[PDB]
């Protein structure tokens, strides 16, 4: 039915090792070369990789900024509002980043904000200028 399993014998493969007198050792040699030609290129990219690993030595540890553990609120200090208006100008609809900047406001109180003061913060204008960048 099939070759006794372990042995590999494609139809196509046979016609290929018969073709001529030494298609035999020809095709067996393409792969012999073809192999070292990869083993070598493994080295190259193992080395290229290795230098880039030394750059990264240090991690980012000297650059990480401590935990802002602060708690969500409801009031809108005039400070908080101005922070917002500026976050919008620099962030667009990224409600998440905008919340992050004002520290103590939920990603929703934000979306909310967008619709209350929409009025007198010309948030239309503001936004169309974030778009213009």
């Amino acid at each position: 039915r099939k070759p006794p399993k372990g042995m590999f014998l494609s139809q196509e493969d046979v016609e290929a090792v018969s073709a001529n007198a030494t298609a035999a050792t020809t095709v067996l040699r393409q792969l012999d070369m073809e192999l070292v030609s990869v083993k070598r290129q493994i080295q190259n990219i193992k080395q290229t990789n290795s230098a880039l690993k030394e750059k990264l030595d240090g991690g980012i540890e000297p650059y990480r900024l401590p935990e802002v553990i602060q708690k969500c609120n409801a009031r809108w200090t005039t400070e908080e509002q101005l922070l917002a208006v500026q976050a919008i100008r620099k962030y667009g609809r990224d409600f998440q980043a905008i919340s992050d900047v004002i520290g103590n406001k939920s990603v929703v109180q934000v979306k909310n904000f967008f619709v209350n003061y929409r009025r007198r913060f010309n948030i239309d204008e503001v936004l169309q200028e974030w778009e213009a960048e």
């Binding site: 372990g6 792969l31 990789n49 900024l65």
Partner: protein, 666 residues
Amino acid sequence: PSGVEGAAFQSRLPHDRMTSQEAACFPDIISGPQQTQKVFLFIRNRTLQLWLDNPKIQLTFEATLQQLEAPYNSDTVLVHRVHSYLERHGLINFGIYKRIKPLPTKKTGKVIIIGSGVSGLAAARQLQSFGMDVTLLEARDRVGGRVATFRKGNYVADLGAMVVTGLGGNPMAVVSKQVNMELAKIKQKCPLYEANGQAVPKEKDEMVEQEFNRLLEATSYLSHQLDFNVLNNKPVSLGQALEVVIQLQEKHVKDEQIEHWKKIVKTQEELKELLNKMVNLKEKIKELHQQYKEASEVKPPRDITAEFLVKSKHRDLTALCKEYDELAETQGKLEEKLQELEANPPSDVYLSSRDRQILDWHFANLEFANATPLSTLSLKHWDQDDDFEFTGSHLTVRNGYSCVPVALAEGLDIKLNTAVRQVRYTASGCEVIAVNTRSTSQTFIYKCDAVLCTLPLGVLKQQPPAVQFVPPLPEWKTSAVQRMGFGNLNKVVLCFDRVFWDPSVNLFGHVGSTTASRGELFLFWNLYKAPILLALVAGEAAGIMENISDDVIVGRCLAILKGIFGSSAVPQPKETVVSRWRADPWARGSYSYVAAGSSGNDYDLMAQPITPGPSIPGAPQPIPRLFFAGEHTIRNYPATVHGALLSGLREAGRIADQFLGAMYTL
């Protein structure tokens, strides 16, 4: 199987069906009612059973009907017709029985038989027992032909045939009850020993052998499923087909490695892309932090745009930090899914050089079995006879196989030292011209009705011809002699004063160094009651060794043996002999094999008798005058003693029918 059916199987016949050659003679029965067929079969089986249960006496028609049963023993023409058919084609009362009716007064017809090789002998006995006038002519000075047995003191060793292939329907089964042969079984246990002289680990031994058998079947797949049977016009040998498979195996071995490391790179190159991303992130993260530090040194109280800047850069940073943690995350996964790959490479090699070399011994063995370079065996047919193999385990003749021809020869007219030189056969008779081997000018002429020719195929192949046919053999027959393969294999006989090998071992192998010399003394046999060792030279090596003195040969022998058993546990051999069968003029080789571009159907050609032209033109078409038996003539049991013996029965049956008339076909 067992009972009556035991006999049918033990006689090489389907217990529950009539054979083609039975149909031949009982065309009434086989074309007739199912009922009658089944009577017949029983009658046949039963008669066989009787003969078999006891083959040291003749089985008469009376003695049969005697032990038969109603309903069966009702119709006595059926019984007669069956017991006769059986008798005639040597299925019963063949070999060496005691007569009951000593041999009918005067004879009938005269037959010359060429060569008293087993085939010859068995046919001659048959004929003589059928009351015919039989003379055999033998070139040699002993009977047996290719059944040589060496004798001297208590040394006893066949340079001829050696093995009985197990009694499961083997005719030799009977022969061995009729003649005192001591049959010792062949303990299948065979240790190997490299060129160095050290055993091959049970570990290896099995890996290689098992790969060997795997390789064989492989070829079979190629042959039947892929149809790899012609190749730019030549028939494909088994050798070719094996190398092609081995190549394909090595090809796959590489194929794998290639796509395995090809996996390493595609991974190691993601690691590369990630790192770049990672560096260029630490790059913004560096400079970005700076800017936040700078924006923090504007001391409060500060206005809102400057307060924003701090808070903003702070988020932008903890954002960029987020990403880089997730990227060293990813980094870690890859770095391990990478010793993953370095931990399990595909196999280094297909076979090592110590492997390829042991495997090579397994090939030598196959060459020894077929007496030939696998480069010459037909891929498609090399093993066609595989189906008809007997059941039970191979044996050896402990007292020398020769005891068997000698046995058969007893009672017969045999002209020893009589080399047939010309067979001429014509409408009205044949004449055979032999000479005396000792003074070759001294001449002989024999006239007969038929010639049975049991000349070795080697002989029939000879150029230019050692026996000349008059008229020449028809072209269809000569082409078949060309196409078929007559092989070669040789033995070396070593005779010592003491056992020094493993006494409980029958056979150990030696592993040669090169492909080229796999056959050279590749296997040794402890078979006998005396301290005798027996070594084979098979394959390509066989033919080459016949050109090298006995000493040199026995040299390489002791050499190999010391190497295995210790450089002085091995004495000098008291007595040594060395066959050269391809040399030997009355054999010109060892036994036939299915050469590439031949088939089984050629063995059938070999057996077809010859029919001379007519004398006076437009006279009636003659009887066939020239017939053939011997090892190369029996499609289903080539190259063997039983195969020969049986070809002999075959032709004798056929000749008797022709000349004494088949009374039983009515």
